[PDB]
Design an enzyme around this catalytic site. Structure first.
Site, PDB file in Angstrom:
ATOM      1  N   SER A 184      42.207  59.439  81.484  1.00 42.04           N
ATOM      2  CA  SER A 184      42.376  58.118  80.895  1.00 42.04           C
ATOM      3  C   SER A 184      41.518  57.877  79.657  1.00 42.04           C
ATOM      4  O   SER A 184      41.678  56.823  79.022  1.00 42.04           O
ATOM      5  CB  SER A 184      42.087  57.037  81.937  1.00 42.04           C
ATOM      6  OG  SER A 184      43.108  57.035  82.927  1.00 42.04           O
ATOM      7  N   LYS A 202      35.194  53.990  78.141  1.00 43.38           N
ATOM      8  CA  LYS A 202      36.394  54.207  78.943  1.00 43.38           C
ATOM      9  C   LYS A 202      36.145  55.345  79.938  1.00 43.38           C
ATOM     10  O   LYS A 202      35.630  56.406  79.561  1.00 43.38           O
ATOM     11  CB  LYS A 202      37.588  54.521  78.031  1.00 43.38           C
ATOM     12  CG  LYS A 202      38.880  54.683  78.767  1.00 43.38           C
ATOM     13  CD  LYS A 202      39.321  53.340  79.318  1.00 43.38           C
ATOM     14  CE  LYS A 202      40.447  53.495  80.305  1.00 43.38           C
ATOM     15  NZ  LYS A 202      39.908  53.944  81.647  1.00 43.38           N
ATOM     16  N   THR A 203      36.512  55.128  81.200  1.00 47.61           N
ATOM     17  CA  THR A 203      36.436  56.182  82.202  1.00 47.61           C
ATOM     18  C   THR A 203      37.745  56.964  82.257  1.00 47.61           C
ATOM     19  O   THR A 203      38.779  56.527  81.751  1.00 47.61           O
ATOM     20  CB  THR A 203      36.148  55.600  83.582  1.00 47.61           C
ATOM     21  OG1 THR A 203      37.142  54.620  83.876  1.00 47.61           O
ATOM     22  CG2 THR A 203      34.752  54.975  83.651  1.00 47.61           C
ATOM     23  N   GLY A 204      37.692  58.133  82.897  1.00 44.16           N
ATOM     24  CA  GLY A 204      38.883  58.930  83.128  1.00 44.16           C
ATOM     25  C   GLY A 204      38.699  59.942  84.240  1.00 44.16           C
ATOM     26  O   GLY A 204      37.703  60.669  84.247  1.00 44.16           O
TER      27      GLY A 204
END
Length: 246
Positions: free
Chosen positions: A29, A176-178
């Site tokens: 993501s 932003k995480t992913g």
């Protein structure tokens, strides 16, 4: 236990921990940062609250909060996969490949899962697209210093919807995480082994420090890798802020 922490202010590297700084992984993501820049630069995304798109029953509902109407703000916050896929389908393959190449994003491979022409909606979801933490830093620095071929509105809007919180001392956190799944080497299929990212920057007054954290598990784990990645990162940044503020 393969990990990597990078933090960098302008041209100086303030922190570099772990062994995997130059190993490429699926962005998962974290690609939404690149998708936000494409969306607002192409005009498909208008501002933080527009366009709002309805949930369709066909969309896989992996997280229950994805059942609500989505706009760019909730897209980042909820990490809504189907919103990303609705956006790329409007971009089309030509423009999507064009931005990926213009951004010089990692390996730039948008072919998708081996054996399906699904790269337009799956290239970043543990498929062909791949990028290293060192490259994530480069890409984020091109956002901070406006070295990408997108408009001012794309910089402004992407920054607005990546905002997370205020850190001690008044440093603002953007990121932003992913979470992705590692793949087999032959036939290239998704494993239950996780890997996870947290990338972004902290900002105060004139100063900006970009960071990238990555974790690859050796065994299964009942917790998303991105949360462990983000949870470690906040501790590094808290200690880094204390050093910078000395």
């Amino acid at each position: 236990q393969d990990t990597c922490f990078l933090a960098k202010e302008n041209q100086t590297v303030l922190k570099r921990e772990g062994n995997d700084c130059d190993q490429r992984y699926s962005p998962a993501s974290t690609f939404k940062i690149a998708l936000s820049l494409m969306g607002f630069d192409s005009g498909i995304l208008k501002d933080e609250l527009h366009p709002e798109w309805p949930y369709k029953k066909e969309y896989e509902l992996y997280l229950n909060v994805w059942k609500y109407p989505q706009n760019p703000h909730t897209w980042i916050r909820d990490s809504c996969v189907w919103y990303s896929q609705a956006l790329t389908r409007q971009l089309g393959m030509k423009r999507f490949k064009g931005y990926v190449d213009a951004f010089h994003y990692g390996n730039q491979d948008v072919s998708g899962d081996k054996g399906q022409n699904n790269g337009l909606t799956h290239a970043w979801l543990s498929s062909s697209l791949s990028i290293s933490p060192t490259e994530q830093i480069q890409f984020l620095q091109k956002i901070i210093y406006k070295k990408l071929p997108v408009s001012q509105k794309a910089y402004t809007m992407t920054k607005n919807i990546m905002y997370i919180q205020e850190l001690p001392g008044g440093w603002k956190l953007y990121g932003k995480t992913g979470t992705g799944r590692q793949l087999t080497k032959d036939k290239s299929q998704k494993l239950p082994l996780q890997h996870g990212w947290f990338v972004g920057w902290i900002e105060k007054d004139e100063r900006v420090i970009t960071f990238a954290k990555h974790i690859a598990d050796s065994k299964e784990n009942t917790t998303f890798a991105s949360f462990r990645a983000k949870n470690d990162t906040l501790i590094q940044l808290f200690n880094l802020i204390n050093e910078l503020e000395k």
